[PDB]
Design a protein around this nucleic acid. Sequence first.
DNA 1: ATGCATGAGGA
DNA 2: CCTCATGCAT
Length: 128
Amino acid sequence: APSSDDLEQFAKQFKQRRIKLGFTQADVGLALGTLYGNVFSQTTICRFEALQLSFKNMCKLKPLLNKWLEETDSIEVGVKGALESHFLKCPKPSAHEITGLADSLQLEKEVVRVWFCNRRQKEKRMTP
DNA sequence: ATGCATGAGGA
DNA sequence: CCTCATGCAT
């Protein structure tokens, strides 16, 4: 398995080469469908180039992007800041903390619950 | 490039 | 409920 440094260098050189070939991020994502039956979105290609995915996600995707390379050659600021503050304190809130913070902050419980799942996921990105 | 979301899968 | 991989919509 690759180091974080391996994946960083791979990402850099993947991006350089995609741009040089004049393909867009969506182009690559689509071609992974066309060529390998594994379609991906522009969002996914973008995150991969920015290392904004988990280490394991990055590792699963790298060989796929490598094959492609080989071949071709809302919530408001008042609310947000507060949400962030609590996260630094309690990153994993109980369904009561959640429902509690939700109404007090005037948001649906489900919007608050998902915000915390996403915030937790971000921290697990190779570069958050 | 990013914010909020879905849904499969698991303790 | 969560983690996780993933993307629609912005």
